[PDB]
């Protein structure tokens, strides 16, 4: 509309209305020029790719993309508390995206010093993939999402994708994608871009911990009319065989007949956070649960949803079982245990097997007069009829949605890193600096982004008499307030925050 | 565990009538409810009564509007391993209240 | 902590009171005032703070 008239205002806040929450977030972004406007082939052998399991082939593009797919984008810590303490469930409904107050800059080195000034004729290209024709990279827990703290300015990530490969070489079925082939909108410093999205119907992400365990659902006061086999022998001696039977009742609860059985397991190795009680060998890769695809071994991470440890063992975590977050200011490679934050899935133990334990036992043979009964450990167990399980929890730092791969079939599409699986997730938003001339003007753009999600809530109806567990802040006096910036102005998140505090009956 | 209301004494004047043990001072508090067993005959039949009482109060709330960024202090029960659940009965069936609970957790600016 | 307190019977002789028509009433709980300075958890102000009994607490002493 004009160079001297602003194209949009600054909206950040949350409106709590009844069963719904509306969270608006507005950030200031900066987009450079990537690859000097050049689509480029990339593969492992460029960096040497010494492992076959690491072999990849794909392209890096000039375009950038916005990623708001982590929760702390949309929720302040306070708003996250109000959500998790008061609600049994939630899920997104509507999405509203806006891109405005674009500004483009040109970079020049005059004499020995660098110069930057407004380029008022330059444009920015932006488009959304609403037919989902491009490779969808959002659901891969990538870095580069909108910053948790609104006063930070962030650098848009460079889009890219991969396709089929054999070793580092491509194949005849491989694909290539020119984002320029998509109709896009072009924006001058007076233009602004917006669109509205509609989440597809998804189940509420449960945010509660069961107050009953799957094997304790019985009435403690009453016997069962069913019978179990108590004794196979009368006593010590020869030819003592017998069959005795007993009522399943309160005195012995292990053997009662039950209608439902815990969810599936794929065993993880168990690592202790006290190092001296860990095997003295490198088992990070050699001892890890993996799955092989087309000859390549992928680590199983995080894997099926399983409790992190038995009750009473808090120093043990699954090797690839849980989500691990870094503390503010943590180095990219080989950091110490204190620097990282390891999340735990103890809340779901009531219905899910422990990740480091065998699912159970099965008989391996037929007993006979000459053969004793023999059993073996079930290390992994697929779905059986009558299993129940809980999904993995979502965190303030964790992902929100993923795209369900488009396939003939799937089971329980809910993604393994947590969040809402969707066949048509929020579409990707691609952006780039229009090239201004293989010799171009060095140029970058900056502007604002606002995003608005409407969340639906499931209120807590419970009749529990005694008070709940609630997420709270300790009243101890410390040098810096938690979830606030320090003297140098750095914002940090002290710990991961789960969603499961309130309880329900099983 | 504390009191709810008190009756503001009927006097010429008072200042900040809010009662000192806490709660809502009122000139016309909830009225007293008196009850007795009708005497059945100075020699009477030894007699007592029993029954039910239900009471219903409607409370108005003031919602928390704060813009505070970092998370509040909240009243919570710790995750503990003990013989008895708090705010519940023991083996002999006795109900107990483990600690006094105050009303002040959320914060405001001064 | 009992050792810090003075070794004398000052429970009634040291208490804030108000007199009405010749009778002394203890000041309880009194005006609303903070119980202790910051970082001084051990101290309590005599009659100033409400005191509740635990379940099964004896009536006297």
């Amino acid at each position: 509309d004009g160079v001297g008239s602003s194209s949009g205002n600054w909206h950040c806040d949350s409106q709590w209305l009844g069963d719904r929450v509306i969270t608006t977030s507005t950030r200031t972004w900066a987009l450079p020029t990537y690859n000097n406007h050049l689509y480029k082939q990339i593969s492992n052998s460029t960096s040497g790719g010494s492992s076959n399991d690491n072999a990849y082939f794909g392209y890096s593009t000039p375009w950038g993309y916005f990623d708001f797919n982590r929760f702390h984008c949309h929720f302040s810590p306070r708003d996250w508390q109000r959500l998790i303490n008061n609600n049994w469930g939630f899920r997104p409904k509507r999405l509203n995206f806006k891109l405005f107050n674009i500004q483009v800059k040109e970079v020049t080195d005059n004499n020995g010093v660098k110069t930057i000034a407004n380029n008022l004729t330059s444009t920015v290209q932006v488009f959304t993939d609403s037919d989902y024709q491009l490779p969808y990279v959002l659901g891969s827990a990538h870095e580069g999402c909108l910053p948790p703290f609104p006063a930070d300015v962030f650098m848009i990530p460079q889009y890219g994708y991969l396709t089929l490969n054999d070793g580092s070489q491509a194949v005849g079925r491989s694909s290539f994608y020119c984002l320029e082939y998509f109709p896009s909108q072009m924006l001058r410093t007076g233009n602004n871009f917006q669109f509205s999205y509609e989440f597809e119907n998804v189940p509420f992400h449960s945010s509660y911990a069961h107050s009953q365990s799957l094997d304790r659902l019985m009435n403690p006061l009453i016997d069962q009319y069913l019978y179990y086999l108590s004794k196979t022998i009368n006593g010590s001696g020869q030819n003592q065989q017998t069959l005795k039977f007993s009522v399943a009742g309160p005195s012995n609860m292990a053997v009662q007949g039950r209608n439902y059985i815990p969810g599936p397991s794929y065993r993880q190795q168990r690592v202790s956070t006290t190092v001296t009680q860990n095997n003295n060998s490198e088992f990070a890769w050699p001892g890890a649960s993996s799955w092989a695809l087309n000859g390549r071994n992928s680590l199983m991470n995080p894997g099926p949803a399983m409790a992190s440890h038995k009750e009473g063992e808090d120093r043990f975590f699954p090797l690839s079982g849980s989500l691990i977050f870094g503390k503010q200011g943590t180095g990219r490679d080989n950091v110490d245990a204190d620097k990282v934050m390891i999340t735990n899935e103890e809340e779901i133990k009531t219905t899910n097997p422990v990740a480091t334990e065998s699912y159970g036992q099965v008989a391996t043979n037929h007993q006979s007069a000459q053969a004793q009964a023999q059993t073996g450990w079930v290390q992994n167990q697929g779905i059986l009829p009558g299993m129940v399980w809980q999904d993995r929890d979502v965190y303030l730092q964790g992902p929100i949605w993923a795209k369900i791969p488009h396939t003939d079939g799937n089971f329980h599409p809910s993604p393994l890193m947590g969040g809402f699986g969707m066949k048509h997730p929020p579409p990707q938003i691609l952006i780039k600096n229009t090239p201004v001339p293989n010799s171009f003007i060095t140029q970058y753009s900056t502007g604002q982004v606002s995003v608005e999600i409407e969340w639906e809530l499931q209120k807590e109806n419970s009749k529990r008499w005694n008070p709940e567990i609630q997420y709270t802040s300790n009243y101890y006096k410390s040098n810096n307030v938690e979830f606030a910036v320090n003297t140098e102005g750095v914002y940090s998140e002290p710990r991961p925050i789960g969603t499961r505090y309130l309880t329900r009956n099983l | 565990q504390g009191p709810i209301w008190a009756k503001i004494p009927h006097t010429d004047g008072n200042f900040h009538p809010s009662p000192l043990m806490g709660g809502f001072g009122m000139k016309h508090p909830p009225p007293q409810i008196l009850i007795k067993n009708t005497p059945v005959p100075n020699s009477f039949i030894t007699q007592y009564s029993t029954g039910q009482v239900s009471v219903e109060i409607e409370w108005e709330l003031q919602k928390e509007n704060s813009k505070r960024w970092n998370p509040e202090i909240q009243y919570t029960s710790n995750y503990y391993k003990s013989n008895n659940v708090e705010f519940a009965v023991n083996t002999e069936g006795v109900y107990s209240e483990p600690r006094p609970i105050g009303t002040r957790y959320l914060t405001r600016n001064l | 902590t009992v050792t810090q307190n003075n070794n004398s019977e000052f429970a009634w002789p040291g208490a804030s009171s108000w007199a009405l028509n010749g009778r002394n009433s203890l000041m309880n709980p009194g005006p609303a005032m903070a119980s202790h300075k910051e970082g001084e958890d051990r101290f309590f102000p005599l009659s100033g703070s409400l005191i509740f009994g635990k379940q099964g607490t004896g009536r006297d002493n």
Partner: antibody
Framework: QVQLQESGPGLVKPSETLSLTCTVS????????WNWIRQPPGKGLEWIGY???????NYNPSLKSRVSVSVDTSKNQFSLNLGSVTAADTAVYYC?????????????????????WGQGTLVTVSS | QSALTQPASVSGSPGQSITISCTGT?????????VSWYQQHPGKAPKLMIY???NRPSGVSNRFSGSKSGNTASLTISGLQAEDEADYYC??????????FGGGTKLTVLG
């Protein structure tokens, strides 16, 4: 992860004052109660006393005369000064931390259950 | 004050519950429900197994348990193992708000 470390001279001549400092790392002194425990070699634990950032202290009645415990919030360390030592004071000295109280509801003195411990230092009292 | 009194040593075979006791005066133990149990491996700092008579911290197995009758508090170790051999100390809050420890008890796992 809170770690405590005791430091100080390992040898003390009789009738001289003994001095030790515990430096907490990973966590600040905060609202916690810092305690000193000593174990004579091959004998049971004994509680020396504690200190609080308000400067409050509580001492073992048998040692109350000759002992002192100080806190420095700036340097994030608290100290032990035990005077007029004899050979009965040879022991391993631990610094410990009173467990955090989750409730601010009542006014009470601390009940001692220790959450963290130093590694301990041996201090020999000899001529 | 006067120390709490414990047996010097207790032994048991792996798999068998074991009970250690500490006797204290009415003012120190009998009076309040604040008795802690510490295990100490040789050369290590004590670890807190049980606090507030029967409570236990996170990180301690079911097998450890404690109880109080009169002037005597008792620590029970169920289904004991090899790693469970250590010195166990009774701790108590006193009338004058002082801490008092038991003499210590050594647990030997027969085998």
């Amino acid at each position: 992860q809170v770690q405590l470390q005791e430091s100080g001279p390992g040898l003390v001549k009789p009738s001289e004052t003994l001095s030790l400092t515990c430096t907490v790392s990973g966590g600040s002194i905060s609202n916690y109660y810092w305690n000193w425990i000593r174990q004579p070699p091959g004998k049971g634990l004994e509680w020396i006393g504690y200190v609080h950032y308000s400067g409050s202290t509580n001492y073992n009645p048998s040692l109350k005369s000759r002992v002192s415990v100080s806190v420095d919030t700036s340097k994030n360390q608290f100290s032990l000064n035990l005077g007029s030592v004899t050979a009965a004071d040879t022991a391993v000295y631990y610094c410990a931390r009173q467990s955090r109280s989750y409730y601010n509801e009542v006014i009470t003195d601390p009940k001692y259950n220790f959450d963290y411990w130093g590694q301990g230092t041996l201090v020999t009292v000899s001529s | 004050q006067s120390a709490l009194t414990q047996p010097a040593s207790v032994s048991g075979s792996p798999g068998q519950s074991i009970t250690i006791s500490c006797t204290g005066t009415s003012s120190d133990v009998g009076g309040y429900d604040y008795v802690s149990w510490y295990q100490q491996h040789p050369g290590k700092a004590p670890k807190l197994m049980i606090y507030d008579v029967s409570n236990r911290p996170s990180g301690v197995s079911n097998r450890f348990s404690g109880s109080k009758s009169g002037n005597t508090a008792s620590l029970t170790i169920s289904g004991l193992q090899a790693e469970d051999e250590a010195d166990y100390y009774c701790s108590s809050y006193t009338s004058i708000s002082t801490l008092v420890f038991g003499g210590g008890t050594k647990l030997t796992v027969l085998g």
